[PDB]
Amino acid sequence: EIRQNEKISYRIEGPFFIIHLMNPDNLNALEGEDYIYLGELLELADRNRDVYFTIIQSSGRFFSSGADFKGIAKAQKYPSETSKWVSNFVARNVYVTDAFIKHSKVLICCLNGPAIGLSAALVALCDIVYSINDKVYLLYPFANLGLITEGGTTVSLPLKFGTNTTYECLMFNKPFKYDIMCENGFISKNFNMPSSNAEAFNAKVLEELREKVKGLYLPSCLGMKKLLKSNHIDAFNKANSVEVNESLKYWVDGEPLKRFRQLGSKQRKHRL
Amino acid sequence: LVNDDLNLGEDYLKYLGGRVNGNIEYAFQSNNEYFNNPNAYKIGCLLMENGAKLSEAALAFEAAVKEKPDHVDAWLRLGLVQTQNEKELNGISALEECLKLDPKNLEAMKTLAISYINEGYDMSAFTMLDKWAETKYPEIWSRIKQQDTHIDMNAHITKQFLQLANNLSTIDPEIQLCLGLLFYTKDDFDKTIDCFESALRVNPNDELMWNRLGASLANSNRSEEAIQAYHRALQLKPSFVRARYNLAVSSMNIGCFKEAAGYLLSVLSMHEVNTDTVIETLKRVFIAMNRDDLLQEVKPGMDLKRFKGEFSF
């Protein structure tokens, strides 16, 4: 049995394993253990012999605002800074990214709003992507925080968006807006709904999916994915291992945490 | 004309600002003679009303909220006194507790949005003002909000509050206040000044509005009018430490240094009344005129009348 999370739930409907991020008031920001819980949920979908599709849905106006940096500038159990950051960043990132890389069921993502950070990195590893309207974007803010690529974006961002686009958006910290997503065929359908109701959007996506899978041999879908994955599996594994160990030096240096401290240090001069 | 909150990136930072520090728990006091006075809440209320010291009212509410941690009004009044006592973290903590018990309190939402603005968490203040609106005028706000890449959060909520202000047949204040706060965070202080001066003509017997006028002015480099509004606020309430601190800051800004050291001694003496917060500003005002005799005597365990002379009251 898998434990319970007040921020991520799931269910099984026919051949669909549906994952739901249900913390809309913090913009679905996830901590380390929430990323490890996603990894576990994907490992749980991967072993059900009745599941063929794995569907990741969200709630609110954001898909996910990224990692949870709440309480990171607080000053207040590790013998060094390297050991601390190994345990608190490298393990989580390597684990959840590899869980997404090797998934054997078809991964579908329903974008109800923007995605940021490691969550956008995980969006760009899903196989099919649906958007609610044309106000969605992906933001990888690594140069502003003092970090480098995460979640296999080294391989997936140039693969799905282009090399020149990726350079212009990552070197200068810009978003992958919706028209860039539509020029590269990133989004498979735009449901064009009001951005206020993500529940109706999620329900509509599931209904349309149920219509599409009528009459197909589904083992065939799983075999075709097994073969289509073998194109870039080695690139992704190599990038995973290299990224999580190259970003450790940026954490240990001390720039990300310094920038975090001077982010939340804007007290005003006079009062009221 | 709005895309989302966080405005197509470029507001991701400034959304992390309101989160990285976390939440601090309320830091109680060790010598609180009201630890078991079953009238401690009553005593706190009567201290708040009778113009007594604010530190003592704060202690009484400490007791009342350590006797029954569900008395929402006790948390509310503790936050109210702690923010006018110039303790923003204790005030924010108390008001957060109150709002978490009573998620539809109005004055808690308002005072907490003002404190957030003071600390620089502008987006949390925006959400709190949105929530105050939709819990105060739910139907009007609900049909305002359903009308649905150029506009950011501040402008969006300013337009919403403007339209809310027009869709009612009065000019009832506490809506002009929030308009002033939105403009204030935008850094166009003259709209804020107009709003606060208008909210005072409808009730010029306020102290918080005079202090907010003082702050809005002093941000715009009108230090003389700032001094005058602080003096007004203090005339209406001599226990108001927020106003003394602001007064001293702007005095230091305009070369008045003996008065400012007197004001900081007075603030450190209004905090230290049980039988404290930033001292660095006192060090700065002493380094301005450079008197080593008092410069080198910095201590959170010292005397204040020991600072006789020019520093003396």
Coordinates of C-alpha atoms in Angstrom, one line a residue:
Chain A
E1 CA 0.0 0.0 0.0
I2 CA 1.1 3.6 -0.8
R3 CA 0.8 6.3 1.8
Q4 CA -1.5 9.3 1.6
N5 CA -0.6 12.8 0.5
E6 CA -2.8 15.8 1.1
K7 CA -1.3 17.4 -2.0
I8 CA -1.4 14.7 -4.6
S9 CA -4.1 12.1 -5.1
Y10 CA -4.9 9.5 -7.7
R11 CA -7.5 7.1 -9.1
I12 CA -7.8 4.3 -11.7
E13 CA -10.6 4.5 -14.3
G14 CA -10.5 1.7 -16.8
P15 CA -7.1 1.9 -18.6
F16 CA -6.3 5.3 -17.1
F17 CA -4.2 6.0 -14.0
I18 CA -5.1 9.6 -13.1
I19 CA -2.9 11.8 -10.9
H20 CA -4.3 15.0 -9.4
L21 CA -2.3 17.8 -7.8
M22 CA -4.7 19.3 -5.3
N23 CA -3.1 22.2 -3.5
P24 CA -4.4 25.1 -5.6
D25 CA -3.8 27.8 -2.9
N26 CA 0.0 27.5 -2.9
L27 CA -0.1 27.2 -6.7
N28 CA 0.7 23.5 -6.5
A29 CA 4.3 24.0 -5.4
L30 CA 5.9 20.7 -4.4
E31 CA 8.5 20.0 -1.8
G32 CA 11.2 17.2 -2.1
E33 CA 9.0 14.5 -0.6
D34 CA 6.2 15.5 -3.0
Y35 CA 8.5 14.9 -6.0
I36 CA 9.5 11.5 -4.4
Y37 CA 5.7 10.8 -4.1
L38 CA 5.2 11.5 -7.8
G39 CA 8.1 9.1 -8.5
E40 CA 6.3 6.5 -6.4
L41 CA 3.0 7.1 -8.1
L42 CA 4.6 6.6 -11.5
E43 CA 6.2 3.4 -10.3
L44 CA 2.8 2.3 -9.2
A45 CA 1.2 3.0 -12.5
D46 CA 4.1 1.3 -14.3
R47 CA 3.3 -2.1 -12.7
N48 CA -0.5 -2.2 -13.1
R49 CA -1.2 -4.5 -16.0
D50 CA -4.6 -2.8 -16.7
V51 CA -3.2 0.7 -17.0
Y52 CA -2.0 1.9 -20.4
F53 CA -2.2 5.7 -19.9
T54 CA -0.9 7.8 -17.1
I55 CA -2.6 11.2 -16.8
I56 CA -1.3 14.1 -14.7
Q57 CA -3.9 16.8 -13.9
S58 CA -3.8 19.8 -11.6
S59 CA -6.0 22.4 -10.0
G60 CA -6.4 26.1 -9.8
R61 CA -4.8 28.7 -12.1
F62 CA -1.3 27.2 -12.1
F63 CA -0.2 23.8 -13.1
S64 CA 2.6 24.0 -10.6
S65 CA 4.8 26.9 -9.5
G66 CA 7.8 24.6 -9.2
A67 CA 9.8 23.6 -6.1
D68 CA 8.7 24.9 -2.8
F69 CA 11.3 27.4 -1.6
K70 CA 9.2 28.3 1.5
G71 CA 11.4 28.7 4.5
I72 CA 14.7 28.6 2.7
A73 CA 16.0 31.9 3.8
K74 CA 15.3 31.1 7.5
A75 CA 18.5 30.9 9.5
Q76 CA 17.5 28.7 12.5
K77 CA 22.2 17.9 11.0
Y78 CA 24.8 17.5 8.2
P79 CA 28.6 17.4 8.5
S80 CA 29.1 19.7 5.6
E81 CA 27.3 21.7 2.9
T82 CA 28.1 19.1 0.3
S83 CA 26.5 16.4 2.3
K84 CA 23.4 18.5 3.0
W85 CA 22.9 19.4 -0.6
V86 CA 23.6 15.9 -1.8
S87 CA 20.9 14.5 0.4
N88 CA 18.4 17.3 -0.1
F89 CA 18.7 18.0 -3.9
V90 CA 20.7 15.4 -5.8
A91 CA 18.8 12.3 -4.6
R92 CA 15.4 13.9 -5.2
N93 CA 16.2 15.2 -8.7
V94 CA 17.9 12.1 -9.9
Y95 CA 15.1 9.9 -8.6
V96 CA 12.1 11.8 -10.0
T97 CA 13.7 12.5 -13.3
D98 CA 14.6 8.9 -13.8
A99 CA 11.1 7.8 -12.8
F100 CA 9.8 10.0 -15.6
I101 CA 12.4 9.0 -18.2
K102 CA 11.8 5.3 -18.0
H103 CA 8.0 5.2 -17.7
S104 CA 6.5 2.6 -19.9
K105 CA 2.9 3.7 -20.0
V106 CA 1.8 6.7 -22.1
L107 CA 2.2 9.9 -20.1
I108 CA -0.4 12.7 -20.8
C109 CA -0.3 16.1 -19.2
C110 CA -3.2 18.4 -18.9
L111 CA -1.9 22.0 -18.5
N112 CA -4.5 24.2 -16.7
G113 CA -2.0 27.0 -16.3
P114 CA 1.7 27.9 -16.3
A115 CA 4.4 25.5 -15.0
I116 CA 7.7 26.6 -13.5
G117 CA 11.0 25.1 -12.6
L118 CA 11.3 21.3 -12.1
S119 CA 7.6 20.9 -12.8
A120 CA 8.0 22.4 -16.3
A121 CA 10.9 20.0 -16.7
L122 CA 8.6 17.2 -15.9
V123 CA 5.9 18.6 -18.3
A124 CA 8.5 18.5 -21.1
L125 CA 9.1 14.8 -20.4
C126 CA 5.4 13.8 -20.9
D127 CA 4.5 12.3 -24.2
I128 CA 1.2 14.2 -25.0
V129 CA 0.3 17.7 -23.7
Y130 CA -3.1 19.4 -23.6
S131 CA -3.6 23.0 -22.7
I132 CA -6.7 24.7 -21.3
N133 CA -6.3 27.9 -23.2
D134 CA -3.5 30.0 -24.8
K135 CA -2.3 31.7 -21.6
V136 CA -0.1 28.8 -20.5
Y137 CA 3.7 29.0 -20.6
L138 CA 6.8 27.2 -19.2
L139 CA 9.5 29.1 -17.3
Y140 CA 12.9 27.8 -16.3
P141 CA 14.4 30.6 -14.2
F142 CA 17.8 29.1 -13.6
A143 CA 20.0 32.1 -14.5
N144 CA 18.2 34.3 -12.1
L145 CA 18.6 32.0 -9.2
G146 CA 22.2 31.0 -9.8
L147 CA 21.6 27.4 -11.0
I148 CA 21.7 25.3 -14.1
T149 CA 19.3 23.0 -16.0
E150 CA 17.3 20.4 -14.1
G151 CA 15.0 17.5 -14.9
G152 CA 16.7 16.5 -18.1
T153 CA 15.9 19.8 -19.8
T154 CA 19.4 19.6 -21.3
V155 CA 18.1 17.1 -23.7
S156 CA 14.4 17.7 -23.8
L157 CA 14.3 21.4 -24.4
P158 CA 16.4 21.5 -27.6
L159 CA 14.7 18.3 -28.7
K160 CA 11.2 19.7 -28.5
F161 CA 11.8 23.4 -29.0
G162 CA 15.0 23.9 -31.0
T163 CA 18.5 24.8 -30.2
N164 CA 18.4 28.6 -30.9
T165 CA 15.1 29.0 -29.1
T166 CA 16.4 27.1 -26.1
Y167 CA 19.5 29.3 -25.9
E168 CA 17.6 32.5 -26.2
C169 CA 15.1 31.4 -23.5
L170 CA 17.6 29.9 -21.0
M171 CA 20.6 32.2 -21.3
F172 CA 18.3 35.2 -20.7
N173 CA 15.6 33.7 -18.6
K174 CA 12.5 34.0 -20.7
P175 CA 9.4 31.9 -20.9
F176 CA 8.4 29.3 -23.5
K177 CA 5.2 31.2 -24.4
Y178 CA 2.3 29.5 -26.0
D179 CA 3.0 30.5 -29.6
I180 CA 6.5 28.9 -29.3
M181 CA 4.7 25.8 -28.0
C182 CA 2.4 25.9 -31.0
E183 CA 5.1 26.5 -33.6
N184 CA 6.9 23.3 -32.5
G185 CA 3.8 21.2 -32.1
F186 CA 4.3 20.8 -28.4
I187 CA 0.6 21.1 -27.6
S188 CA -1.6 18.4 -29.2
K189 CA -4.9 20.2 -28.6
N190 CA -6.0 23.5 -27.1
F191 CA -9.3 23.1 -25.4
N192 CA -9.9 26.9 -25.3
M193 CA -11.8 27.1 -22.0
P194 CA -12.1 29.8 -19.4
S195 CA -9.1 29.8 -17.1
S196 CA -11.2 29.7 -14.0
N197 CA -12.6 26.2 -14.2
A198 CA -9.9 23.5 -14.2
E199 CA -12.4 20.8 -13.1
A200 CA -14.4 21.1 -16.3
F201 CA -11.2 21.1 -18.3
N202 CA -10.0 17.9 -16.6
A203 CA -13.3 16.2 -17.1
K204 CA -13.5 17.2 -20.7
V205 CA -10.0 15.9 -21.4
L206 CA -10.8 12.5 -19.8
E207 CA -14.1 12.3 -21.8
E208 CA -12.3 13.0 -25.1
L209 CA -9.6 10.5 -24.3
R210 CA -12.2 7.9 -23.6
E211 CA -13.7 8.5 -27.0
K212 CA -10.3 8.2 -28.8
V213 CA -9.3 4.8 -27.4
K214 CA -12.3 3.0 -28.8
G215 CA -11.5 0.1 -31.1
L216 CA -7.7 0.3 -30.7
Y217 CA -5.5 -2.5 -29.7
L218 CA -3.9 -1.0 -26.6
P219 CA -0.9 -3.4 -26.2
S220 CA 0.0 -2.0 -29.6
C221 CA 0.2 1.5 -28.1
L222 CA 2.5 0.2 -25.4
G223 CA 4.8 -1.6 -27.9
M224 CA 5.0 1.4 -30.1
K225 CA 6.0 3.5 -27.2
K226 CA 8.6 1.0 -26.1
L227 CA 10.2 1.3 -29.6
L228 CA 9.8 5.1 -29.9
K229 CA 11.5 5.6 -26.5
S230 CA 14.7 4.0 -27.6
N231 CA 15.7 7.0 -29.6
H232 CA 16.9 9.3 -26.8
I233 CA 16.9 7.0 -23.8
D234 CA 20.7 7.1 -23.5
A235 CA 21.0 10.9 -24.0
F236 CA 18.4 11.3 -21.2
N237 CA 20.2 9.0 -18.8
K238 CA 23.6 10.6 -19.4
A239 CA 22.1 14.1 -19.0
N240 CA 20.4 13.1 -15.8
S241 CA 23.5 11.9 -14.1
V242 CA 25.6 14.9 -15.3
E243 CA 23.1 17.6 -14.3
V244 CA 22.4 16.5 -10.8
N245 CA 26.2 16.5 -10.0
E246 CA 27.0 19.8 -11.8
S247 CA 24.3 21.7 -10.0
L248 CA 25.7 20.6 -6.7
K249 CA 28.6 23.0 -7.1
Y250 CA 26.3 25.9 -7.6
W251 CA 24.4 25.1 -4.5
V252 CA 27.6 24.6 -2.4
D253 CA 29.2 27.7 -3.8
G254 CA 26.6 29.9 -2.1
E255 CA 25.0 32.0 -4.8
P256 CA 21.5 30.5 -4.9
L257 CA 20.9 30.9 -1.2
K258 CA 22.4 34.4 -1.2
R259 CA 20.0 35.4 -4.0
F260 CA 17.1 33.8 -2.1
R261 CA 18.0 35.9 1.0
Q262 CA 18.1 39.1 -0.8
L263 CA 14.9 38.2 -2.6
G264 CA 12.9 38.2 0.6
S265 CA 14.6 41.2 2.1
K266 CA 12.6 44.1 0.9
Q267 CA 11.3 45.7 4.1
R268 CA 10.1 49.3 3.6
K269 CA 11.6 52.4 5.2
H270 CA 8.5 54.0 6.8
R271 CA 5.5 52.1 8.2
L272 CA 1.9 51.9 7.2
Chain B
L1 CA -5.4 42.5 -20.4
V2 CA -4.1 40.2 -17.7
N3 CA -2.4 36.9 -18.4
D4 CA -2.0 35.4 -14.9
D5 CA -0.6 36.2 -11.6
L6 CA 3.2 36.2 -11.9
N7 CA 2.8 38.0 -15.3
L8 CA 4.4 35.7 -17.8
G9 CA 7.5 35.2 -15.6
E10 CA 9.3 38.3 -14.5
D11 CA 7.1 38.2 -11.4
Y12 CA 8.3 34.8 -10.3
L13 CA 10.9 36.6 -8.2
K14 CA 8.8 39.0 -6.1
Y15 CA 6.6 35.9 -5.6
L16 CA 9.5 34.1 -4.0
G17 CA 10.0 37.1 -1.9
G18 CA 6.9 36.4 0.0
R19 CA 7.8 32.8 0.7
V20 CA 11.5 32.3 1.3
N21 CA 11.5 33.7 4.9
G22 CA 8.7 31.3 6.0
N23 CA 6.4 31.9 8.9
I24 CA 7.7 32.6 12.4
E25 CA 5.8 31.4 15.4
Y26 CA 4.6 33.9 18.0
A27 CA 7.3 34.6 20.5
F28 CA 5.6 35.0 23.9
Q29 CA 7.0 36.8 27.0
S30 CA 8.5 35.3 30.1
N31 CA 7.5 37.8 32.8
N32 CA 3.8 38.2 32.1
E33 CA 2.1 38.8 35.5
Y34 CA -1.2 38.0 34.0
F35 CA -0.3 34.3 33.4
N36 CA -3.5 33.2 35.2
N37 CA -5.7 36.3 35.8
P38 CA -9.0 34.9 34.6
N39 CA -9.9 38.5 33.7
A40 CA -6.7 38.9 31.7
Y41 CA -8.7 39.4 28.5
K42 CA -11.0 41.9 30.2
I43 CA -7.9 43.7 31.5
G44 CA -6.4 43.8 28.1
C45 CA -9.5 45.2 26.5
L46 CA -9.8 47.9 29.2
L47 CA -6.1 48.8 28.7
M48 CA -6.6 49.1 25.0
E49 CA -9.6 51.4 25.5
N50 CA -8.3 53.5 28.4
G51 CA -5.3 54.7 26.5
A52 CA -2.9 52.8 28.8
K53 CA 0.5 51.5 27.7
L54 CA 0.5 49.2 24.7
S55 CA 3.1 46.9 26.1
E56 CA 0.9 46.1 29.1
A57 CA -2.2 45.5 26.9
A58 CA 0.0 43.3 24.8
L59 CA 1.0 41.3 27.9
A60 CA -2.6 40.9 29.0
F61 CA -3.5 39.5 25.6
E62 CA -0.5 37.2 25.8
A63 CA -2.1 35.8 28.9
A64 CA -5.6 35.6 27.3
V65 CA -4.3 33.7 24.3
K66 CA -2.2 31.4 26.5
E67 CA -5.3 30.6 28.6
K68 CA -7.6 29.5 25.7
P69 CA -6.0 29.2 22.3
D70 CA -9.3 29.6 20.5
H71 CA -10.4 33.1 21.6
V72 CA -10.3 34.6 18.1
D73 CA -10.9 38.1 19.4
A74 CA -7.9 37.7 21.8
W75 CA -5.6 36.9 18.9
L76 CA -7.0 39.8 16.9
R77 CA -6.5 42.3 19.6
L78 CA -3.0 41.0 20.3
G79 CA -2.1 41.5 16.7
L80 CA -3.7 45.0 16.7
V81 CA -1.7 46.1 19.7
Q82 CA 1.6 44.4 18.6
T83 CA 1.6 46.2 15.2
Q84 CA 0.9 49.6 16.7
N85 CA 3.7 48.8 19.3
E86 CA 6.2 48.5 16.3
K87 CA 6.5 44.7 16.6
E88 CA 5.7 43.6 13.0
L89 CA 6.6 39.9 13.4
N90 CA 4.6 39.4 16.5
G91 CA 1.7 41.3 15.0
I92 CA 1.8 39.3 11.8
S93 CA 2.0 36.1 13.8
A94 CA -1.0 36.9 16.0
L95 CA -3.1 38.1 13.1
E96 CA -2.3 35.0 11.1
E97 CA -3.4 32.8 14.0
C98 CA -6.6 34.7 14.3
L99 CA -7.4 34.4 10.6
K100 CA -6.6 30.7 10.7
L101 CA -9.1 30.2 13.5
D102 CA -11.7 32.6 12.0
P103 CA -11.2 32.5 8.2
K104 CA -13.7 35.2 7.6
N105 CA -12.5 38.0 9.9
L106 CA -12.5 41.4 8.3
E107 CA -10.2 43.5 10.4
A108 CA -7.7 40.7 10.7
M109 CA -7.5 40.5 6.9
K110 CA -7.1 44.3 6.6
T111 CA -4.4 44.8 9.3
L112 CA -2.6 41.7 8.0
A113 CA -2.5 43.1 4.4
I114 CA -1.1 46.4 5.8
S115 CA 1.6 44.5 7.7
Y116 CA 2.4 42.5 4.6
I117 CA 2.8 45.7 2.6
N118 CA 5.1 47.0 5.4
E119 CA 7.3 43.9 5.1
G120 CA 7.5 44.0 1.3
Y121 CA 5.3 41.0 0.7
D122 CA 3.2 42.9 -1.8
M123 CA 1.6 39.8 -3.5
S124 CA 0.4 38.3 -0.2
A125 CA -1.1 41.7 0.5
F126 CA -2.8 41.6 -2.9
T127 CA -4.3 38.2 -2.2
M128 CA -5.4 39.3 1.3
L129 CA -7.2 42.4 -0.1
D130 CA -8.9 40.3 -2.8
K131 CA -10.1 38.0 -0.1
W132 CA -11.3 40.8 2.1
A133 CA -13.3 42.1 -0.8
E134 CA -14.9 38.9 -1.8
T135 CA -15.8 38.2 1.9
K136 CA -17.1 41.7 2.5
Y137 CA -19.2 42.3 -0.7
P138 CA -19.5 38.7 -2.0
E139 CA -22.1 39.1 -4.8
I140 CA -20.8 42.4 -6.2
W141 CA -17.3 41.1 -6.2
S142 CA -18.3 37.7 -7.6
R143 CA -19.9 39.3 -10.7
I144 CA -17.0 41.8 -10.9
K145 CA -14.6 38.9 -11.1
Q146 CA -16.4 37.0 -13.8
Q147 CA -15.8 39.7 -16.5
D148 CA -12.4 38.1 -17.2
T149 CA -0.9 39.8 -21.3
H150 CA -0.4 43.5 -20.6
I151 CA -1.4 43.9 -16.9
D152 CA 0.2 42.6 -13.8
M153 CA -1.4 41.8 -10.4
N154 CA -1.3 45.3 -8.9
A155 CA -3.1 47.0 -11.8
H156 CA -5.6 44.2 -12.1
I157 CA -6.6 44.4 -8.4
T158 CA -6.6 48.2 -8.5
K159 CA -9.0 48.2 -11.4
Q160 CA -11.2 45.6 -9.6
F161 CA -11.3 47.8 -6.5
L162 CA -12.0 50.9 -8.5
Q163 CA -15.0 49.2 -10.2
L164 CA -16.2 47.9 -6.8
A165 CA -16.0 51.4 -5.5
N166 CA -18.2 52.7 -8.3
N167 CA -20.8 50.0 -8.0
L168 CA -22.3 51.3 -4.7
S169 CA -24.3 54.3 -3.7
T170 CA -22.0 55.7 -1.0
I171 CA -18.3 56.5 -0.4
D172 CA -18.0 54.3 2.7
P173 CA -14.4 54.2 3.7
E174 CA -12.1 51.1 4.3
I175 CA -12.4 50.8 0.5
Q176 CA -10.6 54.1 -0.1
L177 CA -8.0 52.7 2.3
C178 CA -7.3 49.6 0.2
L179 CA -7.2 51.8 -2.9
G180 CA -4.6 53.9 -1.2
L181 CA -2.6 50.8 -0.3
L182 CA -2.7 49.5 -3.9
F183 CA -1.5 52.9 -5.2
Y184 CA 1.1 53.0 -2.4
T185 CA 2.7 49.8 -3.5
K186 CA 2.7 51.0 -7.1
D187 CA 4.8 53.9 -6.0
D188 CA 2.5 56.7 -7.2
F189 CA 2.2 58.4 -3.8
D190 CA 0.0 61.3 -4.9
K191 CA -3.1 59.1 -5.6
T192 CA -2.4 57.6 -2.2
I193 CA -2.2 61.0 -0.6
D194 CA -5.5 62.0 -2.2
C195 CA -7.2 58.8 -1.0
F196 CA -6.0 59.1 2.6
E197 CA -6.7 62.9 2.8
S198 CA -10.2 62.1 1.5
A199 CA -10.7 59.2 4.0
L200 CA -9.7 61.6 6.7
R201 CA -12.2 64.4 5.9
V202 CA -15.0 61.8 6.4
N203 CA -13.5 61.0 9.9
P204 CA -10.6 63.2 10.9
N205 CA -10.6 61.8 14.4
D206 CA -8.3 58.8 13.5
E207 CA -4.8 58.0 14.5
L208 CA -3.9 55.2 12.1
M209 CA -5.0 57.3 9.1
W210 CA -2.9 60.2 10.2
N211 CA 0.1 57.8 10.6
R212 CA -0.6 56.3 7.1
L213 CA -0.7 59.8 5.8
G214 CA 2.7 60.5 7.5
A215 CA 4.2 57.4 5.9
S216 CA 2.8 58.1 2.4
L217 CA 4.2 61.7 2.6
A218 CA 7.6 60.7 4.0
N219 CA 8.0 58.2 1.1
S220 CA 7.5 61.2 -1.3
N221 CA 10.2 63.3 0.4
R222 CA 7.7 65.7 2.0
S223 CA 9.3 65.3 5.4
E224 CA 7.8 68.5 7.0
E225 CA 4.2 67.4 6.4
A226 CA 5.3 63.9 7.5
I227 CA 6.5 65.3 10.8
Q228 CA 3.2 67.2 11.2
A229 CA 1.0 64.2 10.5
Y230 CA 3.1 62.1 13.0
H231 CA 2.6 64.8 15.6
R232 CA -1.1 64.8 14.9
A233 CA -1.3 61.0 15.3
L234 CA 0.6 61.3 18.6
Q235 CA -1.8 64.1 19.7
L236 CA -4.7 61.7 19.3
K237 CA -2.9 58.7 20.9
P238 CA 0.3 59.1 23.1
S239 CA 0.7 55.4 23.3
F240 CA 1.2 55.0 19.6
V241 CA 4.8 53.8 19.1
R242 CA 4.6 53.2 15.4
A243 CA 4.2 57.0 15.0
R244 CA 7.1 57.8 17.3
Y245 CA 9.3 55.5 15.3
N246 CA 8.3 57.0 12.0
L247 CA 8.7 60.5 13.4
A248 CA 12.2 59.7 14.5
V249 CA 13.2 58.2 11.2
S250 CA 12.1 61.3 9.3
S251 CA 13.7 63.6 11.9
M252 CA 17.0 61.8 11.2
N253 CA 16.3 62.2 7.6
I254 CA 16.2 66.0 8.0
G255 CA 19.2 66.5 10.2
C256 CA 17.3 66.8 13.5
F257 CA 19.4 64.3 15.5
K258 CA 18.9 65.2 19.2
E259 CA 15.2 65.0 18.9
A260 CA 15.6 61.7 17.0
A261 CA 17.7 60.2 19.7
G262 CA 15.2 61.4 22.2
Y263 CA 12.5 59.7 20.2
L264 CA 14.4 56.4 20.0
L265 CA 15.0 56.5 23.7
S266 CA 11.3 57.1 24.2
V267 CA 10.5 54.1 22.0
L268 CA 12.9 51.8 23.7
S269 CA 11.3 53.1 27.0
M270 CA 7.8 52.4 25.8
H271 CA 8.8 48.9 24.8
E272 CA 10.6 48.3 28.1
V273 CA 7.8 48.8 30.6
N274 CA 7.1 45.3 32.0
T275 CA 8.3 44.9 35.6
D276 CA 13.4 44.9 22.2
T277 CA 13.3 45.7 18.5
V278 CA 15.8 47.5 16.3
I279 CA 18.5 49.4 18.3
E280 CA 20.7 49.8 15.3
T281 CA 18.9 53.0 14.3
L282 CA 20.0 54.6 17.6
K283 CA 23.6 53.6 16.7
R284 CA 23.1 55.3 13.3
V285 CA 21.8 58.5 14.8
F286 CA 24.6 58.7 17.3
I287 CA 27.2 58.0 14.5
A288 CA 25.6 60.8 12.5
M289 CA 26.6 63.5 15.0
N290 CA 29.5 61.2 16.2
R291 CA 29.3 61.4 20.0
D292 CA 31.4 58.5 21.3
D293 CA 30.3 58.9 24.9
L294 CA 26.9 57.6 23.8
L295 CA 28.0 55.9 20.6
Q296 CA 30.0 53.2 22.4
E297 CA 27.4 52.5 25.1
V298 CA 25.1 50.4 22.9
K299 CA 23.3 47.8 25.0
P300 CA 20.0 45.9 25.1
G301 CA 20.6 45.6 28.8
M302 CA 21.3 49.2 29.7
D303 CA 19.5 52.3 31.1
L304 CA 17.8 55.0 29.0
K305 CA 18.0 57.9 31.5
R306 CA 21.7 57.0 31.7
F307 CA 21.6 58.6 28.2
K308 CA 21.2 62.0 29.8
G309 CA 22.2 65.2 28.0
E310 CA 21.3 65.7 24.3
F311 CA 20.0 62.1 24.2
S312 CA 17.9 62.8 27.3
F313 CA 14.1 63.1 27.0

